[PDB]
Design an enzyme around this catalytic site. Sequence first.
Site, PDB file in Angstrom:
ATOM      1  N   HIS A   1      10.463   9.436  31.789  1.00 57.78           N
ATOM      2  CA  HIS A   1       9.386   8.471  31.615  1.00 57.78           C
ATOM      3  C   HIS A   1       8.607   8.235  32.905  1.00 57.78           C
ATOM      4  O   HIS A   1       7.369   8.323  32.930  1.00 57.78           O
ATOM      5  CB  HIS A   1       9.995   7.178  31.095  1.00 57.78           C
ATOM      6  CG  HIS A   1       9.009   6.097  30.848  1.00 57.78           C
ATOM      7  ND1 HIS A   1       8.639   5.713  29.582  1.00 57.78           N
ATOM      8  CD2 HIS A   1       8.316   5.314  31.704  1.00 57.78           C
ATOM      9  CE1 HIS A   1       7.755   4.737  29.665  1.00 57.78           C
ATOM     10  NE2 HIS A   1       7.544   4.478  30.942  1.00 57.78           N
ATOM     11  N   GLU A   2       9.308   7.916  33.992  1.00 56.88           N
ATOM     12  CA  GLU A   2       8.597   7.660  35.236  1.00 56.88           C
ATOM     13  C   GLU A   2       7.927   8.922  35.764  1.00 56.88           C
ATOM     14  O   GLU A   2       6.859   8.847  36.384  1.00 56.88           O
ATOM     15  CB  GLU A   2       9.548   7.093  36.267  1.00 56.88           C
ATOM     16  CG  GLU A   2      10.117   5.759  35.878  1.00 56.88           C
ATOM     17  CD  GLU A   2       9.042   4.718  35.566  1.00 56.88           C
ATOM     18  OE1 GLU A   2       7.936   4.770  36.154  1.00 56.88           O
ATOM     19  OE2 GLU A   2       9.334   3.822  34.758  1.00 56.88           O
TER      20      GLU A   2
ATOM     21  N   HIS B   1       4.546   9.326  34.076  1.00 53.76           N
ATOM     22  CA  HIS B   1       3.546   8.527  34.778  1.00 53.76           C
ATOM     23  C   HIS B   1       3.081   9.254  36.028  1.00 53.76           C
ATOM     24  O   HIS B   1       1.890   9.321  36.315  1.00 53.76           O
ATOM     25  CB  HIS B   1       4.096   7.184  35.227  1.00 53.76           C
ATOM     26  CG  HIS B   1       4.164   6.159  34.174  1.00 53.76           C
ATOM     27  ND1 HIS B   1       3.096   5.835  33.373  1.00 53.76           N
ATOM     28  CD2 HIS B   1       5.169   5.313  33.830  1.00 53.76           C
ATOM     29  CE1 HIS B   1       3.442   4.848  32.573  1.00 53.76           C
ATOM     30  NE2 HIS B   1       4.685   4.515  32.833  1.00 53.76           N
TER      31      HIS B   1
ATOM     32  N   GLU C   1       1.335   2.756  29.182  1.00 52.84           N
ATOM     33  CA  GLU C   1       2.730   2.744  28.738  1.00 52.84           C
ATOM     34  C   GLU C   1       2.857   3.350  27.339  1.00 52.84           C
ATOM     35  O   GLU C   1       3.741   4.178  27.081  1.00 52.84           O
ATOM     36  CB  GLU C   1       3.276   1.304  28.765  1.00 52.84           C
ATOM     37  CG  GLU C   1       3.564   0.721  30.170  1.00 52.84           C
ATOM     38  CD  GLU C   1       4.562   1.542  30.967  1.00 52.84           C
ATOM     39  OE1 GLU C   1       5.212   2.414  30.369  1.00 52.84           O
ATOM     40  OE2 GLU C   1       4.692   1.353  32.187  1.00 52.84           O
TER      41      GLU C   1
HETATM   42 ZN   LIG Z   1       6.245   3.089  32.032  1.00 55.75          ZN
END
Ligand SMILES: [Zn+2]
Length: 396
Positions: free
Chosen positions: A214-215, A218, A241
């Site tokens: 997830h990170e 980003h 998000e």
């Molecule tokens: Zn996030």
Amino acid sequence: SSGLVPRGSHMEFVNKQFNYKDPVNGVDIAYIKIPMQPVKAFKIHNKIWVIPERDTFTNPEEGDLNPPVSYYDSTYLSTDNEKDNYLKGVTKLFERIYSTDLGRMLLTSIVRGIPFWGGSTIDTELKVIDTNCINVIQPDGSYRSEELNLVIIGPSADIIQFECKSFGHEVLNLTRNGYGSTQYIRFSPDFTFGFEESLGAGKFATDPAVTLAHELIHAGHRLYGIAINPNRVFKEVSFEELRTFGGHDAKFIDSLQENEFRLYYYNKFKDIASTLNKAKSIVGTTASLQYMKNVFKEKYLLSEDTSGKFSVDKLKFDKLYKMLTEIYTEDNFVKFFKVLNRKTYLNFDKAVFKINIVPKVNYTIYDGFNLRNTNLAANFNGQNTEINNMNFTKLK
Ligand SMILES: [Zn+2]
């Protein structure tokens, strides 16, 4: 044993089996300074460093671990055994991510996503931006500047506030103008979050490889400067998000909005192409203009005509943009890992667990907690905090 190399002789993405006490050497184990006293850091891959320390550096107002869904413990990660375990756990997760097709795609994209050399006040001069580098100390004590794309670092005061952040520019918005900037991920492999799920309802733990991915998603957005303005939200959950989570959550971004976003960043990529075309000089390097042009031709998949002039090809842009924003999603990593995960971005619990994924009896690159040929192999039992209770200590 940590099971860092389940197949083959050597780890496929991380370049060394590091120990925290390995000697510094100025190349891939070094004392470094962020643009403070130097910290010991480990270069796990081209463009990627790991600082096994609590983050008291990136944000000056967060220079202390004092407490003011959160969890605090000012002693966590203060000893060398912990920093060694942190390093090995992050190493293990990168290898877990890289053992899937999707993760090899995403990490390749990340490594190629060098922050743009847009730092010059002279629009014919390419120049690095200082905050996309670290200073790496050699054994003999000198410094050299090294460009990098990604730093994994320990959390600041709130141990479970994981995020992907970066240094800003006085005028440029590097995460949204196509340029990109070095990304700092606050993350710990030593804790995870609980969610409830009914296969009575069960109390399960998020696989930290999902959280790290997830990170990293980003980071991919921000390295290619295509992040969505954090002021676009559903009332707050940001579009950024929702896009990173993926799945049906992403379908809620109205699709006409998406086209508007895509056209905006297409034009930003075109601005980058013509900056590369109007470039006459380069400073701060021994490498030619033409060579750094080609680094960025490669990053943004620019086309080059016989004259040597760069442009954006619409099909290549849509391919890259779709990969970064639609293919690289948490939901898709869940499907590749075959793990249990919350089904929507908000449905996490307040529960926090201490874990230790380093020993291969606890967690493996191929199966996460759900160890094959054990009772944890089925029904996601390995992530069930009651069945596999030896792997989860509840803290809050
Ligand atoms: Zn996030």
